[model samples]
Target chain A: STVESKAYRDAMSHYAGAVQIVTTAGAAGRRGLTLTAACSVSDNPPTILICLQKIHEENRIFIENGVFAINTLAGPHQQLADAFSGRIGLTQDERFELAAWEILATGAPVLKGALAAFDCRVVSVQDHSTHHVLFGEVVGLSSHAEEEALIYLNRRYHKLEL
Target chain B: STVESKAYRDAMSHYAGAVQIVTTAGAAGRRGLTLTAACSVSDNPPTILICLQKIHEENRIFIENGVFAINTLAGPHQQLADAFSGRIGLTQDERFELAAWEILATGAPVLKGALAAFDCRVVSVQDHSTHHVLFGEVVGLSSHAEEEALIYLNRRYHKLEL
Candidate 1:
């Protein structure tokens, strides 16, 4: 029935996942954050979702911009992941400089060497207790023909072997 | 704008995810199937979603029952995952016997000793082109505090330690 919150976290930490960066920029300016909570929501509408903490500064920018890019990091992008994760002491602009990017239809910077990237427009937003679940309809996407992936597991990053 | 189907699959495969078997049983009878599409949907209603191919046998059962459990497998449960994934042959009853289970508010079997288990009631279902997104309000949960998790990455299983 009822379980403690710490127990939930401990259990979830056991399930490993790939890491992603949800980036956005608009009249409000540029902002980005790393997340492991992104996932495919539906295929017909070409939708995907990410859970964003309400406290993050960029949360509002994403909601207001109504557009975001999900950058699926490759192994070489660990440094970028760290920077966006707030591990590296870099200003938003400095971090943006780490990767070569192109402006997608949404004006968000899509990482050049990412394994895959989705440029999406927000379709709906539902408030979770501590986070906002942002649903997006994929409008554009890019991927390298063949490349290894970067993953987040056991609280660390790993590169796929095959 | 519409994108090619192959492109979508290729892009998603790049972002690896753990394979899970969501199981259910009630007045409609018992059924289970493999899923790699579960995603946290919202926290306010405390919702999570899993997409089921309409062609699957359990599709109608889940829709009519309006509840199911999400069992995050542990490293030791690989065989169980494979069994439910349709990789191994077994009758419906045989499959249900593979794991220790307990019923909750929804009368759905919650896999006991799972890394994490969520008992939920269906809140909404949306038809995507190829799959149905079943969104559920999580009503109950449980987990083992010290077990490692089983994750699917790059089309394989990996255990997490932290």
Candidate 2:
């Protein structure tokens, strides 16, 4: 049953999630997007889970490339996140130019100043209406805690003193 | 393929998520637990996604009942969350005394003061090695704007100013 769109979105907007930019590269080329629907599945085999609107071209590229990186954003990287998510309407090539990147085991570009980066390979894809639930097994990892992380909540950005 | 436990865990702690108390009832009796691993899927059918350690007794009860309610918490509910998540060593009955609940469409208890409540029926479930990803199709929904939603991050709970 479809509920009123505003009711559902309004309720979900209360959620606070880590701001992340998931990036991918391969035969499908490179792509990245800002999202909050990503989480760690289990440490064994080291997995990351993500869901994306099925129609987004980035969603298909993640599957076709078979590899991606979960780049947890930091306090200073909000502009990078906005560009990649196209909040500024930046082209894919333009977004990639905004950050320093390096390839890990999975051949995806890892964001150098990310709070943490999980270089991974897509292990599975489950289709849900309007979206794809992806399971990526971590192939390599990098993390830096020198700066505080960025948070998204109530449809806005917030920082915790701790 | 396994990443170092601390490295993986430390990285994931940055992912802020909305705190919800998932409750279940029926032949298995009643049980609820506080968690942050719940999210909305698509609005077309009004679905929710949740995951938990497959070994928990609460996990089995949810499957048997075929229903559960996601009660998004507020700042005042921190103690209640702590009790349900085992921070307080109270029995299930003791935990229920902390707050008043009402029965919703699925016969599961909905927290009266939750930021929002989603009553749902289990549509399907998928098992990963250490956990199960549950897909619940929402059948009823309610929201309360009286308080701000609670958030869990860095292994602690925090509040946002909406």
Candidate 3:
């Protein structure tokens, strides 16, 4: 049965996910976007997955780069999140100036204050009707030891209280 | 390099997720289990992905049914989450009764008053060694308007406030 729905909004409302910015660079230059679609796919091989809408302009850049970084947002990085989310109206390079970011082995800019970061290389790409599901093998990862994270729920940013 | 660490626990601690009781019943009778591995796979096709440990007792039943419902628990349904998580002792049917559930098009029991429910048919299954990646094409879905939800973070249950 076909049902009418706004899937992005519906799924977002149901799943309480931490907000993160997926960054991509290299030969295609730099592009980053705020996303909550990142999640673990496998642990044995250290694989992570992210789904990006095919229509997203950055989709091509991400595919072309073949490598990207999943920068888990820290509690105080809402400004950085907003910047990548297009709330700040800045170009990709300009947004990188918002915080101290470094290029990882994947050649993707990883935010310095992120609670954790995963530098990954694309292993497989699955094209769905409106989204591109990218599975990446974690080649490098780091964390800040102990840092609260920025969360997205019910269409708003939240700080971890504990 | 294979990292044998329990990264799932660490990631789950940092990233809060909704608890869902995925229920299925067919010629083989009823089986239900708690899961936090459910995530949206795509929006356009209304796809979702859930990772199931291949060794889990109920694994065969899910594969046999080839259909499942992801019932996102409401805020006050922590006990339901516990029940399905195999914490509280209950028979399959008793656990199924933990919440008011209804069968959708696929005859999978979807808990009513859940934050949201998705009826899905397995579209693809990928074996990633220890875990089976089940991708489902969401055929139907429904949600209660304006209901708070249950979130699992840092190995604990949390209710949405404000």
Candidate 4:
């Protein structure tokens, strides 16, 4: 019933997702990575969720800190995404240096020019075989109104607007 | 620190999402709905997750049926997405008639020309106040190679290739 992992991954690649730099900053430390494994969960409480690799230290820090921000990228932030995604072999601090950030309700670093940034408090965390899913309650938000967004698809970056 | 509901929704709308028609069939009956609250969870287990409104009776049946198919839409299926999304008040059967469908491992209806169809068995589900987060383990898969996919952004639909 299962196909080869390569086929599954290739199939997923075709799913266009808004580029995001999910950041967590608090007592443990501040760090971020490019992400697309996220989606809205509900509206009554304004909740959303993001999936992260269990092995990533950020996963541990996120729950410990109980806060993170999902910064949906804008067209001009491709290099910033690359920096966060490790394309430059830069250290964590170096990745932060790529953009201007501001404070959100949770003290998480909110990207200054993000198309939209959801400041969320970790409401719950669930562990699966290789990943951790965090359900976040939106506490604050910021948006670069009407900006074209940076998107990822088929392993490449694209600037698109509807 | 919280943004208003309208602002939060406007901001979330900026997210680019691959459209999917989630379908299920069994003793509980057959039904499908258009959804964007879905994303791949992990590749190791070939898993994916979808968020659904718990208020819908179909949510209960999906769980009871024990299986469903995540049919990632193609550009040509915009009207299908609209119909399922309720833009057109078509009966469930009328919606299914819009395109060709075949059965997958779960007996769930699979879109014949979807960018990909992940036939999965519901492995786990969790209730989050107003939504049911369904985690599915991919049991069977199908794909249409080289097809452009359907994506939604800013409350509008667009066709694009990676």
Candidate 5:
């Protein structure tokens, strides 16, 4: 039975997650999306996981490319998050124009001014209910920033007080 | 080559995450652990995921029980988060005494004063690196709270406004 799904969504909205724009390039072309469903998996092999909604073609680009970068958004990147989330009607290629980009070990586009960016190689992919759990082994990183992180909670964006 | 692993960890520290206490009780007895790696998976099935370190016996108990509850902490629950994190020398059973407990669809212990609680049944468990990604289908929920949330960033806890 489909019960308490709305209740569950309301409860999860209380969760404050750091906003991130995950991007990928290579044979699949450049693609990116905004989400908070990403987290560190393990430090042994330097692993991380990003859960992408299975229905989106942009999300599949990460899998097809076999590499991606997690760009942790700071307080000033609210509009970038919205653009990558597809709420602002920006085309996929047009979204890349919104920010300065670079690269690391992988060919994925890295946000130049992000709080941090993890360039990784796809290690494995797990198919869950309605999302693909993509695990990546960190191969390169850029973590030099002192800006306050952007967080989403209660259906709005808020800046973390550092 | 084990390059830039510390750099990756340092970058991840900039990401802010909400504090949560995951608890379980069944044939494996009662056990709970503190973490910030919990997130919503899909709302269609009302699923969520919590990453647990593979080294701990306590973590494996959750898999044995096949049920768990995620208790999102509020601002005042900092000490509770500490106790559950196992930093204060509290025994497994002693931690439960630190806060009032209840249960919903699952028999896992639920915090009475949490910002929200999601009682879930184990849907799947995936082994990745040094952690176990446990996915749960939300069968029950509790989301009645107006308190500030507790978030962890840069190695410390802070309260969220509103």
Candidate 6:
């Protein structure tokens, strides 16, 4: 039997995931959102994958642009995370104004001081139910190893000492 | 230009990922491995996705059985995490012997004191270079809210207060 819905959600909430700001920029325009659903897929080819819910038209730009950047947040970026996630009702312009940014090889907006940023070219997209899996080939990356990392769990943000 | 492979790997090492022991059992028999490439895909369908490198033949059993469990480990389970990932050289039988286990709806082995366990039915598998993306429909779950979580980053394990 399937578990009760809320209970299943509760169980998932316990999974600590790295908080990130996934952004895209191109002819389709710039779009960004807070996401925790990302992980390394392959090392040799340098790939990462992320999941996005099929709720807003904004989510489409990620695939449309065919380029994106994963800006992994650090402890001090909590407010920035909220702004981009729509928890604060900020517009896309205002959200980008919250942080300094730069571009890597893929022409995506990479957070200037993120714990790490992976600039990638979209390689594939897999649709399943209400979500789409976006696979990217990391073209370039930057890292600040001295910073603490941000993780989301139980509906709140927690910092991990690095 | 693509990033240098070692630099790309180094950048990814900064991302903190939840450490988990994913297990499966059935006609394919028992198999388990520690994985960090997992995330929730769609809550409406109660789905979670995980990535596994197409390295060992043992990984094939997960697809063969079509049932698996994600046992999110707590801070104290670092040794178990290491063991299952082959750092400790424990056999499949010995790994199961390391902890008490129970079964949920999918007949996958659920760790007794895991931070949380999601028993699931494999709904789909997508192939990418050198890896497989598995999407599972959550059929049952268990949570232990009182324990701290274990996260891996910088090639070391850290505890996250929950």
True contacts kept of each: 0.52, 0.43, 0.36, 0.65, 0.64, 0.77
The DockQ score of candidate 1 comes to: 0.47
- lDDT of each candidate versus the true structure: 0.72, 0.73, 0.71, 0.75, 0.73, 0.75
On residues B80-100, what C-alpha lDDT tens digit does candidate 5 reach at each position? 777877788967777777767
* Candidate 4 chain A worst ten-residue window by lDDT: A54-63
TM-score of chain B of 2: 0.92
Candidate 5 or 2, higher DockQ: 5
Residue B52, candidate 6: alpha-carbon lDDT = 83
Per-residue error (Å), model 3, residue B150: 1.5
Prediction-by-prediction clash tally = 6, 1, 0, 0, 0, 0
lDDT of 2 by residue, A4-66 (tens): 766778777765677777777778787777777666567665666777896666467777777
Provide the lDDT at B26 for model 1. Answer: 68
C-alpha lDDT of residue A63 in model 3: 83
Winner on lDDT between 1 and 5 is: 5
Error of 6 at A62 (Å): 2.2
For candidate 3, what is the interface RMSD?
Answer: 2.8
In terms of DockQ, which candidate is stronger, 3 or 6? 6
lDDT of 3: 0.71
Q: For model 3, how does the per-residue alpha-carbon lDDT over B1-162 read when each residue is reduced to its tens digit?
A: 433357634644566565677778788777877777666665555677888877677678888878887776666666666777777687877776545656668898777666677787887878776687887876776766655766666666677753
Please give, for every candidate in the order listed, the TM-score of chain B alone compared with the true chain B.
0.88, 0.92, 0.88, 0.91, 0.93, 0.93
Query: If you assessed candidate 3 against the hidden native complex, which CAPRI class would it receive?
Result: acceptable
Lowest lDDT block of 10, candidate 5 chain A: A1-10
The list of candidate 3 runs beyond 4 A from truth reads A6-14, A145-147, B2-12
Q: What is the C-alpha DockQ of each candidate?
A: 0.47, 0.56, 0.47, 0.64, 0.65, 0.70
Best by DockQ: 6
Q: What is the interface RMSD of each candidate, in Å?
A: 3.2, 2.0, 2.8, 2.0, 1.8, 1.7
Which stretches of candidate 1 lie above 4 Å from their native place? A145-148, B41-46, B76-78, B87-89, B103-106, B145-149, B153-162
Which whole-number lDDT from 0 to 100 does residue A95 have in model 3?
A: 77
Q: Over all chains combined, what TM-score does candidate 6 have?
A: 0.93
Q: Tell me the lDDT of model 4 at B72.
A: 72
lDDT of 1 by residue, A55-119 (tens): 76656888887788888777667777788878769788888887677876879888776778888
Estimate, for each residue in B1-162, the C-alpha lDDT of model 1 and write its tens digit.
756666777677667787677877667777788777777644444667777776665578878766788877766777877787778788888988765778777778777776667877776677666677776776677767654666665556776554
Q: Which ten residues in a row have the lowest lDDT in candidate 2 chain B?
A: B146-155
